[PDB]
Amino acid sequence: STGSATTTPIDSLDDAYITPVQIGTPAQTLNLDFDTGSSDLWVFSSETTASEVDGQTIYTPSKSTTAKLLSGATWSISYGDGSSSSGDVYTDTVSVGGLTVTGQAVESAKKVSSSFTEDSTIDGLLGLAFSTLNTVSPTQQKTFFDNAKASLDSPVFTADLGYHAPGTYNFGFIDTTAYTGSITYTAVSTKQGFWEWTSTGYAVGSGTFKSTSIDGIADTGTTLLYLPATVVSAYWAQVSGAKSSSSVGGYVFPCSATLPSFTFGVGSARIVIPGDYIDFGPISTGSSSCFGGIQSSAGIGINIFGDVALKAAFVVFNGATTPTLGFASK
Template identity: 45%
Template sequence: MHSTTALIAALAAVSLPQSQAKPIEARQLGGLGAAIGGTVDSAAGSGNTGGTVGSILDTTVSGTTDSTVDTLNNAVGAVQGFTLQQEEYGKRLKNGPIALGNLYKKFDVDMPDDVYDAFDVATQSQPPNELNKRAAAATSSVKTSTLSSSVKPTSSSIATTSSKVSSTTVAIATKPKPTGGSATATPVNQFDTAYMIAIKVGGNTVYVDLDTGSSDLWVFSNQQPSAQTQKHNIYSPSPSKLMQGYSWNVTYLDGSTAAGNVYNDTVTLGNMNFTGQAVEAAQYASDAFVAASYDGMLGLAFDSLNTVKPKQQRTLFNSIASQLPKPLFTSLLKHNAPGSYDFGYVDTTKYTGAITYANVSTANGWWQFTSQGYSVGSGAAVSQAVSAVVDTGTTLMVMPSNIVNAYYAKVAGAGYSSAYGAWVYPCASSMPNFNLIVNGAAQTIPGNLMTYGPIDYNGNCYGGLQANDNIGVAILGTIFIKSQYVIYDQSTNPPRVGFAKQAGLSYN
């Protein structure tokens, strides 16, 4: 066996710990040559081959240079793939009206009047630094609203039931118009843990949100005013890496914007270094981004959504896909716990049962597929084709109104609130599972994961499932994704998305 071939084969056989968003260091490689040498002996059938490879590698490691480590990292990654592990990184506000408004803004769709009014009040009532903050603990000084109103229950019959929804009303806090310095009352547990991914751009570590619904890699940088970067890790690019004449501008989340220059630089993901990547350095970011718990976004949708001008750039994933064992990545996001993304391989220990695949349409640049139906709890499946987008950058799940109505018909005390532009219900209500039918298999969200969070001090909750009025497609945000092991696979034509049950998660 040729020595280079033997080395690659050996690297394939040696089991190295999966990275947690940091590259292999030279001190981790001591004695690796001996281990690989033994492996090469077995593969080549010659002790001399293994000894030679092992000796060369250990000699190289003894005086390890950055380029040597990079070569080893990428050789291992090209055979094994790599993992990015989420880390706890501050807190983010759980505000239902803002979350739903964010979704409409991100997909550039006009909000229904109720949704817009609720979003407008919520964003004006919350100081910018409270919208999405990096903080050790939530504040608890917000005063409780003494006003209340009833929730408007649906009065239309649902296809899956012969009875109408109960007319029981739920007392909720109204959303008063902001006056002076007052703020809309929000629950004491209005903050949720934010989980981010650490990557390196150039020589700087930043924490980013991986977003399958956008296609830009942008980060806070030293080119912004200092007031915008005080609470962020920043990218300090070398002027020599500037892509002359290139710029970018993104608008998403709550309609906030960020813009800046583009650099050709090295990006480190897990234990692999990728040179020649388009890194978008912010020169400006609006208040919501400044107050956010992340230092940037890593978009994992398709190239057509990239905002760089005058020529769109490939997404980071598409740029590195040829260097991976397989051109795919997976997400394992969890409820109240850090999750992970695997690149280049499918980890069979992270899911149970079969994987169900669906073909993806890339016409809109999203991971978009068609589901064939749904069911609620133990009820019968209802046939209904729905075009859906898998989006890790969106919190809620939105579906056609008739599906949403059918679900909340099975939730005691649930009703539509015109005050919040959304479905709410008593937090104590028992929530049924929701099953999305994909190619004959039910992709289940356990009922206990269907709630977004409390909406007031009266014991009411904001539903994680809401109507997709005006949007035209269903959006499967983290309410859905946190119950699934998801595979985003570009090894097929067309690409495909796969779903399986998470290992260790109860679906009863």
């Protein structure tokens, strides 16, 4: 089997992407944030504290003839941006882009933190990291990909995120029309539950490539590119007037700037992030200070190849017995 679904930016800045997901019988379609950095599929629901729902579409298990309470199971998750959610668990039928999994754990939110409430466009998350990170207790549950894997034509999914445009998540096949040149594959460590890999280095603009190992995670659920302070300083030093602002919480730059590109290494291959991808717009409405899309990972404890980086590539998440990651230009 295979599946193919379009993923759409939630706003003009590509702060995140939503993909429609069918849950239950008859189908209830919710727009979920596909997140290769976590492993819980959770949704706003009829059980969510009413004051914490503000415009999201909710899953109502009582209206689904295939929903079953997973007795005794609870879940609770916190994300890198400090947001969180928690609740109980149903199993139900879940389909993405024509690919159907029966008995998928659908984690129903009783509580969500303010940033989730305040984002009316995201109805929940669909985790695509390794199932060892799943938070369901006392019986850990499998991700949608993990459950679908054996049925897939090939045990892979691909992320093709757009810049200011829709893109595609495919399951079970590699669309050879969706990228240019070749896909370069690189080793993955699953030790921390992530799609963790090592970039071979970087360049800033038309500058020379610096060969250096940068361990990090491929994370579709993080907006920005978080890299070591040395790398980030070298990038922003090429933008007149750029500075790290503690009051804003990162690097900002004059909105009048033309940003240089940023290249990262995948083995001997190179992925080029155009400068425009690194612009996240005014820090507040009407400001001439703009927020940068490359930020320091110092104090995160890990480097994160978030959407800023991934959207410059066609990315293969290869879930073979020994997982790997592939990157192609597009």
